[PDB]
């Protein structure tokens, strides 16, 4: 299953990748990665780069993706904040020159803006770009991640989507950013690397 990556943790710091990739899912997805927009991101950065030079993981441990969790102020639990921390500290020990590119879904673009909003200027100088689909803290944060360079922040915000908009609906919906990731994200990753 695509569903669960470890490769950061599996890493070994000689043989490190061109890029790292880091993604948190969304509410309710299974594994590390998820079933939607996480898999989709990292297909793309290994039909890009090689699956040699890409180093995908997702943000498991403590970060369980449950919908409780959305309606704490920073939209997640802290475990999951520095759970994603903590996998960004270890891509810089192990390899601090590969370009670390990130991305997150939902409650899992709290996690990415979370964790790298508190992040040392060593590390967020090594995240390269990050990609958040549907960021539930648009309203509240303004479509960009604190702390962290909009240059390298690419937020998708469909219309549609309620969690854009300064709240939270929960109920079974379609998810909205299949061409986003597929095609836009890819691409603005891949002008960022590196």
Same mark, same amino acid.
Request: glycine residues 10%; neutral net charge; charged residues 15%.
């Given at each position: 299953?695509?569903?669960?990556?470890? %490769?950061?943790?599996?890493?070994?710091?000689?043989?490190?990748?061109?890029?790292?990739?880091?993604?948190?899912?969304?509410?309710? %997805?299974?594994?590390?990665?998820?079933?939607?927009?996480? @898999?989709?991101?990292?297909?793309?950065?290994?039909?890009?780069?090689?699956?040699?030079?890409?180093?995908?993981?997702?943000?498991?441990? @403590?970060?369980?993706?449950?919908?409780?969790?959305?309606?704490?102020?920073?939209?997640?639990?802290?475990?999951?904040?520095?759970?994603?921390?903590?996998?960004?500290?270890?891509?810089?020990?192990?390899? @601090?020159?590969?370009?670390?590119?990130?991305?997150?879904?939902?409650?899992?673009?709290?996690?990415?803006?979370?964790?790298?909003?508190?992040?040392?200027?060593?590390?967020?100088?090594?995240?390269?770009?990050?990609?958040?689909?549907?960021?539930?803290?648009?309203?509240?944060?303004?479509?960009?991640?604190?702390?962290?360079?909009?240059?390298?922040?690419?937020?998708?915000?469909?219309?549609?989507?309620?969690?854009?908009?300064?709240?939270?609906?929960?109920? @079974?919906?379609?998810?909205?950013?299949?061409?986003?990731?597929?095609?836009?994200?890819?691409?603005?990753?891949?002008?960022?690397?590196?």
């Amino acid at each position: 299953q695509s569903s669960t990556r470890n %490769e950061l943790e599996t890493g070994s710091s000689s043989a490190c990748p061109k890029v790292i990739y880091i993604f948190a899912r969304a509410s309710t %997805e299974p594994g590390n990665m998820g079933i939607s927009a996480g @898999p989709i991101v990292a297909d793309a950065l290994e039909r890009i780069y090689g699956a040699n030079d890409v180093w995908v993981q997702g943000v498991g441990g @403590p970060y369980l993706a449950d919908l409780a969790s959305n309606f704490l102020p920073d939209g997640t639990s802290s475990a999951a904040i520095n759970e994603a921390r903590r996998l960004f500290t270890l891509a810089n020990t192990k390899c @601090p020159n590969a370009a670390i590119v990130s991305g997150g879904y939902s409650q899992g673009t709290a996690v990415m803006a979370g964790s790298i909003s508190g992040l040392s200027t060593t590390i967020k100088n090594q995240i390269k770009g990050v990609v958040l689909f549907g960021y539930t803290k648009n309203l509240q944060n303004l479509g960009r991640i604190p702390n962290f360079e909009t240059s390298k922040t690419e937020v998708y915000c469909d219309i549609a989507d309620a969690v854009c908009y300064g709240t939270l609906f929960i109920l @079974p919906a379609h998810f909205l950013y299949q061409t986003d990731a597929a095609v836009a994200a890819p691409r603005f990753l891949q002008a960022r690397i590196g």
